[PDB]
Structure formats: C-alpha cells, structure tokens
Amino acid sequence: LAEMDETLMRARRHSYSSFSKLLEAYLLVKWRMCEAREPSVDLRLPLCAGIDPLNSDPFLKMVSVGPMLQSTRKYFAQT
C-alpha cells in the first residue's frame, strides 16, 4: 500500500510534455460535420422505457442510430 501511495505521489508531482504516442497521432486528424442522418425507427414507438422525449439525448441517439438488432456474441465470434 505504501508502494501504491509513493507511486501515485511520484506520478502527480512529475511534469509531462505530451500524451501517449497514439493520442498525439490521433490529434493530427480533423473532420467535417454535415447534414444529419435519416431516422432509423419511428419517433413515436417506445423501445426502452424511460428513453423518451423527457430524456432527450438518449432518445435522439437511439432514433438516429437505431438499436442493435443482432446478438453480440455471434457478431464477435467472427471477429
């Protein structure tokens, strides 16, 4: 536990100059947003309880992207 504590203190007190190489590579890329997608399902169909207009952001993400209609175990079995 003392090893934990001293390691965390060492990490905190130090000074850095960059993130990991991967993130520095990622920041070299920039994109461009455009017109919105097409609705995936009808806007007035309840799918998950609570995900409703009073719960805007999940509702909008779900209706824009659409639910995963295929089981994940079999999908990742081939990956």
Binding site: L22, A25, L28, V29, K30, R32, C34, A36, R37, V63
Partner: protein, 77 residues
C-alpha cells in the same frame, strides 16, 4: 454501430479528393483506424447522429502510418 461504421463515416472529403487525405496503398489498415475516430467524434457530441466526412491529416497519410508503426514496434518493452 456497424452500419454507421460502414455508410456514415466517409473517408473521402465532401468537396472531393484532397492532397493530404490520400492513404498509401499498402497502409489500408488506416481505413480501419480512422473510422473509430469518426465514430468517437460523432457519438461524443450531444444530439442526433450526423454524417461525417474526413477533412485533413496534417502530416499526410504516410507520416501517420510511420508514427503508428513506430508505436507498434516500440510497445512491449
């Protein structure tokens, strides 16, 4: 997320081909990576999902590939 990877993360700029957005022929795996970056950008933002187009890579595709390969080799030490 699969369909959004396939048909809503466009790796070609909307206005047409740009100079820096060219992928070297044998570095096609960048096509796989950049899809995740587009996905993260579109999903992080609040609101509806948005069609996204690649805009520019600062160092060009080749430099990004070299940096990725450098990380790939140096890890595990």
């Amino acid at each position: 997320f699969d369909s959004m990877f396939k048909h809503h993360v466009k790796l070609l700029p909307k206005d047409g081909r740009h100079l820096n957005t060219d992928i070297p022929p044998r570095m096609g795996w960048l096509r796989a990576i950049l899809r995740f970056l587009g996905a993260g950008m579109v999903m992080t933002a609040t609101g509806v999902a948005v069609d996204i187009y690649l805009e520019d890579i600062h160092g060009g595709g080749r430099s990004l590939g070299q940096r990725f390969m450098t990380w790939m080799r140096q890890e595990g030490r």
